[PDB]
Design a protein around this motif. Structure first.
Motif, PDB file in Angstrom:
ATOM      1  N   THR A   1      52.654  37.059  35.116  1.00 35.25           N
ATOM      2  CA  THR A   1      52.019  36.532  36.417  1.00 35.25           C
ATOM      3  C   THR A   1      53.148  36.151  37.345  1.00 35.25           C
ATOM      4  O   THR A   1      54.299  35.773  36.924  1.00 35.25           O
TER       5      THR A   1
ATOM      6  N   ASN B   1      48.558  26.742  37.775  1.00 36.14           N
ATOM      7  CA  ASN B   1      47.479  26.470  38.613  1.00 36.14           C
ATOM      8  C   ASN B   1      46.381  27.541  38.374  1.00 36.14           C
ATOM      9  O   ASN B   1      46.513  28.322  37.247  1.00 36.14           O
ATOM     10  N   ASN B   2      45.561  27.876  39.173  1.00 34.14           N
ATOM     11  CA  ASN B   2      44.447  28.689  39.164  1.00 34.14           C
ATOM     12  C   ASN B   2      44.970  30.024  39.001  1.00 34.14           C
ATOM     13  O   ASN B   2      45.655  30.579  39.810  1.00 34.14           O
ATOM     14  N   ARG B   3      44.778  30.765  38.041  1.00 30.82           N
ATOM     15  CA  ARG B   3      45.191  32.104  38.035  1.00 30.82           C
ATOM     16  C   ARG B   3      44.021  33.316  38.570  1.00 30.82           C
ATOM     17  O   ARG B   3      43.088  33.523  37.519  1.00 30.82           O
ATOM     18  N   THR B   4      44.138  33.611  39.524  1.00 33.40           N
ATOM     19  CA  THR B   4      43.177  34.455  40.338  1.00 33.40           C
ATOM     20  C   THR B   4      43.471  35.850  39.789  1.00 33.40           C
ATOM     21  O   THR B   4      44.625  35.879  39.444  1.00 33.40           O
ATOM     22  N   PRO B   5      42.865  36.852  39.934  1.00 35.07           N
ATOM     23  CA  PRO B   5      43.122  37.928  39.270  1.00 35.07           C
ATOM     24  C   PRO B   5      44.048  38.948  40.169  1.00 35.07           C
ATOM     25  O   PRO B   5      44.045  40.189  39.805  1.00 35.07           O
ATOM     26  N   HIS B   6      44.545  38.390  41.355  1.00 38.76           N
ATOM     27  CA  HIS B   6      45.749  39.182  42.098  1.00 38.76           C
ATOM     28  C   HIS B   6      47.003  38.387  41.508  1.00 38.76           C
ATOM     29  O   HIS B   6      47.871  38.846  42.166  1.00 38.76           O
ATOM     30  N   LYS B   7      47.031  37.530  40.608  1.00 40.80           N
ATOM     31  CA  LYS B   7      48.144  36.760  40.394  1.00 40.80           C
ATOM     32  C   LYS B   7      48.386  37.003  38.933  1.00 40.80           C
ATOM     33  O   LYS B   7      49.682  36.917  38.498  1.00 40.80           O
TER      34      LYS B   7
ATOM     35  N   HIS C   1      42.931  42.412  40.405  1.00 41.49           N
ATOM     36  CA  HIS C   1      42.308  42.463  41.756  1.00 41.49           C
ATOM     37  C   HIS C   1      42.131  44.043  42.105  1.00 41.49           C
ATOM     38  O   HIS C   1      41.398  44.372  42.834  1.00 41.49           O
TER      39      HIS C   1
ATOM     40  N   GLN D   1      31.146  37.044  48.087  1.00 38.47           N
ATOM     41  CA  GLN D   1      31.244  35.785  48.936  1.00 38.47           C
ATOM     42  C   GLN D   1      30.099  35.878  49.622  1.00 38.47           C
ATOM     43  O   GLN D   1      29.500  34.723  49.719  1.00 38.47           O
TER      44      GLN D   1
ATOM     45  N   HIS E   1      39.357  45.636  40.278  1.00 41.15           N
ATOM     46  CA  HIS E   1      38.221  45.237  40.672  1.00 41.15           C
ATOM     47  C   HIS E   1      37.667  45.681  42.031  1.00 41.15           C
ATOM     48  O   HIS E   1      36.667  46.269  42.227  1.00 41.15           O
TER      49      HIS E   1
ATOM     50  N   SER F   1      49.938  29.328  30.764  1.00 41.84           N
ATOM     51  CA  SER F   1      49.269  28.824  31.844  1.00 41.84           C
ATOM     52  C   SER F   1      48.746  27.368  31.258  1.00 41.84           C
ATOM     53  O   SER F   1      48.435  26.556  31.974  1.00 41.84           O
TER      54      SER F   1
END
Lengths: 139, 69
Positions: free
Chosen positions: A116, A98-104, A1, A19, A4, A92
């Motif tokens: 993570t 769960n969902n591995r968003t790019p801040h995790k 994150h 978004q 990005h 994972s």
């Protein structure tokens, strides 16, 4: 994150514009005289519009080539990032986290080690959602 | 906002989010945060568009303040 956000702010954007773009292009098709009642084709075309207009698929590689002062370092970093990301994908995949968003997802810029946080598995209350059967394979 | 609340003509906030943030405003810091935080949900700033714009403005100002520390 963080990578990005640095890429988005290096240009004239901020990543909440993604978004805003998907919200505007997804809200501009719910109107009357329906051009796209199917959500999937519209979602795929705004996915391609995001990947072309805003964030190309060479951001992470370009950031990490600009990060190291030699190509030996980038090559060894990538060679370790592939193995550590394979271990992360296994952790994972098994235990269904769960969902591995790019801040995790955190990366060590001196080794290539990937880890993570928020390693919480996903437990669904239903026994009803399953491709497998309910009775015979498990009781 | 992405849960498909409506097909999004001009939406409004639910009552539980407003009661949660008026609880958090009393659980905030007392003297100086509250008279400015309260000026952003009394005057009908929650309509799911100026609410998110206010939150983004406050987040950017706070991140610049914490980066100048």
């Amino acid at each position: 994150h963080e990578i990005h956000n640095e890429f988005c702010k290096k240009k004239g954007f901020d990543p909440d514009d993604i978004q805003d773009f998907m919200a505007d292009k997804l809200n501009a098709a719910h109107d009357d005289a329906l051009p796209a009642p199917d959500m999937t084709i519209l979602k795929v075309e705004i996915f391609n519009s995001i990947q072309t207009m805003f964030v190309p698929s060479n951001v992470l590689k370009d950031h990490f080539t600009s990060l190291f002062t030699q190509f030996e370092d980038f090559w060894l970093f990538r060679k370790q990032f592939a193995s550590q990301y394979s271990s992360f994908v296994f952790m994972s995949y098994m235990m269904m986290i769960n969902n591995r968003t790019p801040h995790k997802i955190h990366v060590d810029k001196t080794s290539g080690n990937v880890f993570t946080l928020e390693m919480l598995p996903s437990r669904f209350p239903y026994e009803r959602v399953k491709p497998l059967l309910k009775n015979h394979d498990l009781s | 906002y992405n849960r498909l609340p409506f097909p999004r003509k001009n939406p409004k906030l639910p009552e539980n989010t407003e009661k949660n943030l008026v609880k958090f405003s009393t659980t905030l810091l007392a003297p100086y945060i509250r008279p400015k935080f309260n000026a952003d949900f009394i005057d009908n700033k929650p309509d799911y568009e100026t609410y998110i714009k206010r939150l983004r403005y406050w987040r950017r100002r706070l991140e610049n303040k914490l980066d100048r520390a």
